[PDB]
Design a protein around this motif. Sequence first.
Motif, short mmCIF file in Angstrom:
data_model
loop_
_atom_site.label_atom_id
_atom_site.label_comp_id
_atom_site.label_asym_id
_atom_site.label_seq_id
_atom_site.Cartn_x
_atom_site.Cartn_y
_atom_site.Cartn_z
N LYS A 193 52.69 -1.89 -4.07
CA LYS A 193 54.37 -2.04 -4.63
C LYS A 193 55.13 -2.08 -3.25
CE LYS A 193 54.18 1.08 -8.46
NZ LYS A 193 52.84 1.28 -8.85
N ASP A 194 54.56 -2.32 -2.08
CA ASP A 194 55.20 -2.17 -0.81
C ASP A 194 55.68 -3.59 -0.46
OD1 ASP A 194 56.16 -0.55 1.50
OD2 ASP A 194 55.16 -2.25 2.30
N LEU A 195 56.91 -3.91 -0.50
CA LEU A 195 57.49 -5.14 -0.29
C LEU A 195 56.98 -5.87 1.06
CD1 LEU A 195 59.81 -7.18 -1.50
CD2 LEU A 195 61.40 -5.80 -0.17
N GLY A 196 57.24 -4.83 2.11
CA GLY A 196 56.71 -5.09 3.46
C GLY A 196 55.36 -5.60 3.57
N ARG A 197 54.52 -4.66 2.85
CA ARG A 197 53.04 -5.17 2.78
C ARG A 197 52.74 -6.37 2.06
NH1 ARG A 197 50.89 -0.38 0.73
NH2 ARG A 197 50.89 0.49 2.93
N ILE A 198 53.65 -6.75 1.29
CA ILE A 198 53.21 -7.98 0.44
C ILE A 198 53.40 -9.16 1.11
CG2 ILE A 198 54.13 -9.41 -1.69
CD1 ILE A 198 54.19 -6.59 -3.14
N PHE A 199 54.82 -9.20 2.00
CA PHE A 199 54.90 -10.35 2.72
C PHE A 199 54.15 -10.45 4.10
CE2 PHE A 199 58.77 -10.33 0.14
CZ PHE A 199 58.98 -11.57 -0.24
N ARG A 200 53.41 -9.24 4.39
CA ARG A 200 52.32 -9.28 5.56
C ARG A 200 51.23 -9.88 5.14
NH1 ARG A 200 54.98 -4.24 6.60
NH2 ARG A 200 53.23 -2.96 5.44
N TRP A 201 50.85 -9.52 3.88
CA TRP A 201 49.53 -9.83 3.40
C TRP A 201 49.81 -11.67 2.94
CZ3 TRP A 201 44.83 -9.20 2.32
CH2 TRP A 201 44.19 -9.94 1.07
N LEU A 202 51.02 -12.12 2.72
CA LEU A 202 51.30 -13.47 2.54
C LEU A 202 51.48 -14.41 4.02
CD1 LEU A 202 53.62 -14.03 -0.72
CD2 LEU A 202 51.40 -13.42 -0.36
N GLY A 203 51.66 -13.47 4.95
CA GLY A 203 52.07 -14.15 6.39
C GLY A 203 51.02 -14.28 7.37
N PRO A 204 51.12 -14.79 8.47
CA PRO A 204 50.21 -15.21 9.55
C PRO A 204 49.13 -14.17 9.61
CG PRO A 204 52.13 -14.94 10.52
CD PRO A 204 52.42 -14.79 8.96
N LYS A 205 49.46 -13.08 9.54
CA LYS A 205 48.68 -11.79 9.88
C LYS A 205 48.09 -11.15 8.58
CE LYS A 205 50.50 -11.97 14.22
NZ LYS A 205 50.75 -10.77 14.86
N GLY A 206 48.16 -11.86 7.31
CA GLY A 206 47.45 -11.38 6.28
C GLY A 206 46.44 -11.92 5.77
N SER A 207 46.09 -12.36 4.48
CA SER A 207 44.77 -12.99 4.20
C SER A 207 44.72 -14.09 4.61
CB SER A 207 44.82 -12.97 2.40
OG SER A 207 43.88 -13.66 2.07
N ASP A 208 43.56 -14.55 4.88
CA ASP A 208 43.08 -15.85 5.43
C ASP A 208 42.58 -16.91 4.54
OD1 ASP A 208 40.48 -15.19 4.85
OD2 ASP A 208 39.96 -15.09 6.91
N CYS A 209 42.58 -16.53 3.11
CA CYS A 209 42.01 -16.93 2.02
C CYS A 209 43.07 -18.28 1.62
CB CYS A 209 41.94 -16.21 0.73
SG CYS A 209 40.35 -15.10 1.45
N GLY A 210 42.45 -19.33 0.77
CA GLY A 210 43.23 -20.25 0.20
C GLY A 210 44.28 -19.79 -1.13
N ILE A 211 43.81 -18.86 -1.60
CA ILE A 211 44.22 -17.94 -3.05
C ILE A 211 44.36 -16.66 -2.62
CG2 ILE A 211 43.92 -17.17 -5.14
CD1 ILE A 211 42.03 -19.48 -5.78
#
Lengths: 507, 509, 508, 508
Positions: free
Chosen positions: B432-450
């Motif tokens: 639920k963590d807003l900051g965690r979600i955008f970190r996951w979506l950002g350059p240090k987040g998931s390296d996947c295509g989905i």
Amino acid sequence: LLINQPQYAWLKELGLREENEGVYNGSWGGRGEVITTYCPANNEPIARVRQASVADYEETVKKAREAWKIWADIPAPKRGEIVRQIGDALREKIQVLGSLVSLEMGKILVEGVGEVQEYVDICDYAVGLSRMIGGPILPSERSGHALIEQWNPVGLVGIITAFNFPVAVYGWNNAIAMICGNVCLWKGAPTTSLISVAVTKIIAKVLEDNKLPGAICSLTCGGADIGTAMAKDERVNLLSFTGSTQVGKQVGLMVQERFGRSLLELGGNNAIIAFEDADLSLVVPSALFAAVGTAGQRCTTARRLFIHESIHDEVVNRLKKAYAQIRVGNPWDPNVLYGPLHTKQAVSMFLGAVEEAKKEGGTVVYGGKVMDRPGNYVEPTIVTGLGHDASIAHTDTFAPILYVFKFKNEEEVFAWNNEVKQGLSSSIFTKDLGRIFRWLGPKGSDCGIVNVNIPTSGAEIGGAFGGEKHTGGGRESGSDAWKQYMRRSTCTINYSKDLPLAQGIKF
Amino acid sequence: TLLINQPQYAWLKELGLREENEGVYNGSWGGRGEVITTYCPANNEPIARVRQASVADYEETVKKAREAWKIWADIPAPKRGEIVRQIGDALREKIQVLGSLVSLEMGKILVEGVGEVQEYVDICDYAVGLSRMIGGPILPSERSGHALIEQWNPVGLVGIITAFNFPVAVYGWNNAIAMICGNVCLWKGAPTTSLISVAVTKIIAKVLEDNKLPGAICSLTCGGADIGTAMAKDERVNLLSFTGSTQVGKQVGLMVQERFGRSLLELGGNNAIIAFEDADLSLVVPSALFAAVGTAGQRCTTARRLFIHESIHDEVVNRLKKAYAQIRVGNPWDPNVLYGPLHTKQAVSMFLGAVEEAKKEGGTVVYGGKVMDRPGNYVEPTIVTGLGHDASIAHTDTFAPILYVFKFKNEEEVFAWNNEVKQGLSSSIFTKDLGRIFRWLGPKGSDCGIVNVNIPTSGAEIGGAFGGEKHTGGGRESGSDAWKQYMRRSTCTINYSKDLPLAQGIKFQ
Amino acid sequence: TLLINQPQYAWLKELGLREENEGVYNGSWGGRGEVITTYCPANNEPIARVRQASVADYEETVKKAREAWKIWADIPAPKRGEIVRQIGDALREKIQVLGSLVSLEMGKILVEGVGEVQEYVDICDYAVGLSRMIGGPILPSERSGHALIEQWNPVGLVGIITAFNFPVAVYGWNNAIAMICGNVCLWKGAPTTSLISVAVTKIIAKVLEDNKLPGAICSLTCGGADIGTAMAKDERVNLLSFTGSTQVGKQVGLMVQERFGRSLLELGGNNAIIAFEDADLSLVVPSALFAAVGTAGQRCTTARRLFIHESIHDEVVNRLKKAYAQIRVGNPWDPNVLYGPLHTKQAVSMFLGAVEEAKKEGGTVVYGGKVMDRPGNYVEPTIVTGLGHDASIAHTDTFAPILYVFKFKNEEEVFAWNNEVKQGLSSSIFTKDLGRIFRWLGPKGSDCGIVNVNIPTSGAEIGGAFGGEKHTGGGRESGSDAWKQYMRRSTCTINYSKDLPLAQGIKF
Amino acid sequence: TLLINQPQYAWLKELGLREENEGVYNGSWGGRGEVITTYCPANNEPIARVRQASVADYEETVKKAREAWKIWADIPAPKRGEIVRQIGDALREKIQVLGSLVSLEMGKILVEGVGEVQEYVDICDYAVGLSRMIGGPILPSERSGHALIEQWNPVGLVGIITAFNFPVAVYGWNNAIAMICGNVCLWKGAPTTSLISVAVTKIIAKVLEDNKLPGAICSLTCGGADIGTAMAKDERVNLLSFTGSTQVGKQVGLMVQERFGRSLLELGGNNAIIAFEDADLSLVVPSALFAAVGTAGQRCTTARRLFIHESIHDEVVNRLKKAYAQIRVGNPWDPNVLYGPLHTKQAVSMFLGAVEEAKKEGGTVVYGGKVMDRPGNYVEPTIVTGLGHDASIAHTDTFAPILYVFKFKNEEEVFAWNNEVKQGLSSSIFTKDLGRIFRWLGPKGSDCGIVNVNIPTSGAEIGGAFGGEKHTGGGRESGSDAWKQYMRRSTCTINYSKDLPLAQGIKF
Ligand SMILES: [Cl-]
Ligand SMILES: [Cl-]
């Protein structure tokens, strides 16, 4: 050494010395072999560069990927501001930097300056793009879901460039890769090592003045060994390679082998086609300047001139009368239009290609000889009477030799344009509206650059630059070429408390 | 006796299927290659046979597709879109029996077989509109009296190699996009789903023939490694779209690169779900269940790795064990059945192998690990705890329903663990963590295509681009601007002025 | 006696029409307003009657539509796209009888009536894919830990006012796009095409009801200036799309601006074709004839002005004269017919007045100028030469098949003459000259919203945005990013970081 | 004595300003209208004088600008971008003295005066790249041998009316975008910031003149309502961008609509911040303070309404009061001053009236509410609690530093209350709830042009389109495709085939 002669003292305005460090990553160094680069206009040595050892390469990659952790966190518009300042620092050095391009590479001063201006211009463009890069927010088919296409930097972009555009091609890759949040590792052409050092010094000062780690724009001068390491290195997330098709093929395979990303910009065997209704007062100068420009050493150089039979002999005779007026001289001197080839070997290649062209029935109607003066000067050459499929006209030699062919109809000469292995640039000269749009359509040119009433070298930073087929498929500069420097993710955020499935599947 | 000859299965005739079917279509039907028999994985019984393409069949088909291309590329994209619209309708009219054939020959449950045909119907309806939009910008030239235009044209022949686990939708994504883009298509599907490929091609062939178009626009050449290798080495195949294993995709990518062709690679995934301490567990458990056991764990986007924060690890595992027990098993065509068989006998053998090696590597089977005692290729969906995230068995590309559960503590490490695998297809976090979600979506987040949040790793819609990074091969299918991989860009400058270039001191005439 | 009560027109029932029809739909059918009778312009006989909206009908309909929007706005765009797909199929199934109704009530030939339904079908199928695409960019914020996103949301209630001359397609363009964008629609069509509006509404209502959606998503309030004025003054109508005359559109635009609403105005055109000396005359002559005489000269994009270069002026008029004499006239449903009746008796009287005035101003009628002595509102398609480009009659907006032919010498003046009229919808040059074509497309070329080369002023396709500049009113329909007019943009910054703002010396 | 004549203000001459300045520029400097004196709100002393534009001045300037446009529209967009790049650099070199002039004549603190110039610099640098990007799609025609092309061309003359509170940046946004889009501009700034307008115009004039371009590309006609009304009525003004009050902006919209012109309206905001139970209070309190008292509460985007959930209401108000007491008031050019004077004496009495009116309507002044006893137009930043959300003074449009504080209970009512006002510029919620954040951004969320999360109502950057809905006027400036409002779209079909239309029975 020219740099030790008072006539070339201006080289110190670029921070160049007798011996220069060819490794930059925040610190300057170079433990590899020392290379001397030569002025092709007189065959005299200019200065020396200490190239990268493997240890230098390793240290640089590690420091650039450390730098990436900082730089990737900087908002793209603030990265654009850094790129803006690089544009300005280049603006301040444009005359001396352009003069070094003329000195070390051999192109005339207006084109050396023009190459720096192109980097300046791509920087200024990148500033705006840095507030624009991104993807769509799309309507999910599921209630309470957001669907977002995100773009993120690939990380480390390695950049291998060639001698003939020793500033602009790096500048294209650098500016776009930087605003996209990547760090860069540059290995330039060995015979333009001084240009690579000079450019890198300009950039490093901007990075340092902004208290950014220098390895954001790293340099490891070197040849095939460093380039092969880059192609093999899983740490190089994108390898942008500009050079020969033979080398680029091996680079593409090595990158593919490790499931890397490559951006390949390779040869062109570019044709100009003059139809019967063409403005010859436009065709004749367009062909001359596109063939002899840069002494025929551009990827986009007009190598093949197809002329309709009805006007073939007139265009050839007007080309001869205009070739006779090309002003040959030192590339830095005013009103010089034509300089030397880049190396002594290219003069040997020129001679070999001329002898083979005649051995295939071609007639050298102008030029064909080495010039009897210092430096790597050969006559701009026109060869007629070959068939379109002649072996010599499908060989790839950076030589100022224009192969002229007759043609009779539109469909056959379009096929002849398309018949070669490369696919970079192409031009037709015509007034026929239907012909122009066919040329631009599915049955037209197969090239990445498809021009009309402008030669094979007409291309501006606003569009994507690159080719198809054995040109290698990469794009640089404008349009959405920036996506090649970034990783697309398709992101779905479920902000609801249910789990609707796509395609309405009830599980 | 063959299933198609049993009265129970008279409906296979509604797809035009016979006891022995021709596996080559190029406007005419045929095939001089090896005959293959496909089997129903729910009962190991043979369904029907397909005569596959020889190299000569494939040779002839390429020639006729490229002949067909001269006609098709002259057809305006919106009218090409209309042909695709009619394909989507023709699929709609057969969605149930085609869905049943998918369940019968491939083995996924009926709702997923119909759902996969619906993916094809959807991309068709999507492509209709896209056919009036594809193209590039007209740009402002810096030169007076010049126009600057970005043109997009078909690459020509698109070879499409697909796999067994999505025998309809993946070809459908490639086909509908390649078609509106003005390309002809050549399809070499998975050998073990040859009937599905024949059935789909028969639906498309009728649409093309009813529109008096050359059938080779959507050619079919059934075959295996021989035909696929030929396509990878065929300079006449302008774009090769390959979906399948990383190992084969690697060689296909090399063969296409060697000849300066284009490839679009959709390879494996080793997809992680990460449940953080603040995750809604009523979303975690059903999501992890569907992501792992959907299609009996045989999707490219199947969840293989379940990372759970230490605080909630045991609770989530216990709830997942219970939910696994409630899984309704049966014939994949049967009602309320949520779990069918594996695709092959071999997959069963390798499944038992993976289970044993995971044990030998220190894992605990907390649910399943055994073959189900019933006809067909049924295994128990399986959960393994206690392995390290770097455990060798959890970095094997096995298409088996074995979910590897790992503990984690902090966000930075588990993001790195998501990223540490060779592939990079799909990934999901529950938080639920807003900051965690955008970190996951950002350059240090998931390296996947989905890159998903609070949903499983599987079940993409068609609106976005589909594909992965790293050893997933980099290609994209379906939505966004994926269509550009099927076309060639040209940057076009038109000098429309009477202006002459600067004489540069030269005296012209 | 009503045509609908005669056996030759029994097919009208297939569209669910009866002798007296309800002109209000909001989920329920009704109509407490005045009863209007619409007439077939081919024979001036009454077809059937429609009970129009009272103002209380309208008020109840707005209320129900805005209630329906709460449900509809929450439906994901791609599922709204599936509803629009189904509308396209429902239209597909009735395309022949609905096309025939357009020909019966409006007067255009069957092939164009059917083709108008097909245009609605086509934009529906276009909108299905667009429903998976509408939105804006996620953009890089200059601030660390901030997302910058451009969101698009429905404006809410889209009022749609349409004209008699395209009684299906214009509504269809607005409907399909407004619907996938998450808006509900309220339609007030032209009074003289009320049966068509009812028939279209019945088809859509069936689709909505079958999907268990509130009918008020596509509401209908048949009526005239009374209901249109109410819509233009109604703060609850978040976007008013108006297709009609410039005079009325001007007043609508001001009423909406007065209340800070949004309008989309598709007003008249005075569209020119320019034939240069190098033009393909076998392309010019048929293009000019079909653009001037198509729909009996009653399209917004009808060719009104034919500028011919002095060198070819006489040949083209003569070639055009011989072509007009071959236009087959007849009932608009008869298959061989190219030319139908005008839409009203009043249009005939005004056509005759435009002809007489054109003669008084120095024009010569080189073909036509007269009513035909058969039933219905038929006049001859007319060509007038000799007038100056500034002749007052040439700048009157009259929906009559009268084609004014002018001479010109050079490109600069004739571009100026294209641009001198108050409207700015469509325009065409015929030429082979590359530079002239790109100048026509450039900043010193045509000032119109549609800029055509070697094709006539009509016949646009759904892929591009349709609409004009100047007194044409500025709106765009159909393709490109015209969908943005049906939605509200928001620029959204999401701070997802834990960063505190700079304290600026204050102790918090 | 004029401030410009006092030795300590000699820096004003670095901007080319003198005792009396010409307020008309069109390539030549002039001004035959009334002389205006502008005053420094920090001390109410006259600064210098400007000769404003007469009607004759306006007429000559429009004529010269339209002549210049013929040259400017022919310059390639990227070369226009290079001119805008040099404008950016020219502003860079004056950024300190120009920022200081903004602080002197308008009264905002120096970091905001400088920041406003930096915003013009930044949009110039952005427009340089945009100048190589503007255009439309080439689309696939449904017809063989046809190209379908969406062209974009300059509208011509863009008139730009701006307000006192952002006397540089708003013009900058309009100027840089309109310029790369191939338009010429005509600027009428706020009379009370005439010297700022002159100074900016001198900086641009030198760039145009150094590049041998006609100065009327960026024309200035200083004046008030008479000049603005002329622009609103002038058919030669192809687009009128207006930033100002809703009351004037409505009349400008009507006048432009009356002539079928284009307007771009950026009017009032009545902007709300909403703090939910789960909000980070360490982020809410400074965010509300800086958004409310910034520019002495005279921003379009100033936080006027602060909704706090009942659980955290009193705590937030108490913390706001402790921080408000720490606001450093002073001369806006003095270091570490946070808060300066109101723009005018009039604004002070308005402030006074609203404070007593809030009291009469049931509010409690918990902080501020009084005029400060010093030179200039200084009033205390004011917090008012206890009013109902519908209290009439909170729906009054005052540029006063008065923050109205409200309680709320649930998400649905407070979203509705954000939306209930007539304007729709900016809006902000503070919350951690993921679902609530996406509801706020969705169709049942905020109805404003700016919809922010965990950042206050002044959160805006040039990459995004800036503007609002409803009575805010609908215009957009700066980023995204805001550039399209400065250009005219044409949908262009080129038939390049030798294919003839169907003869349809006719023998051509
Ligand atoms: Cl010549
Ligand atoms: Cl506080």
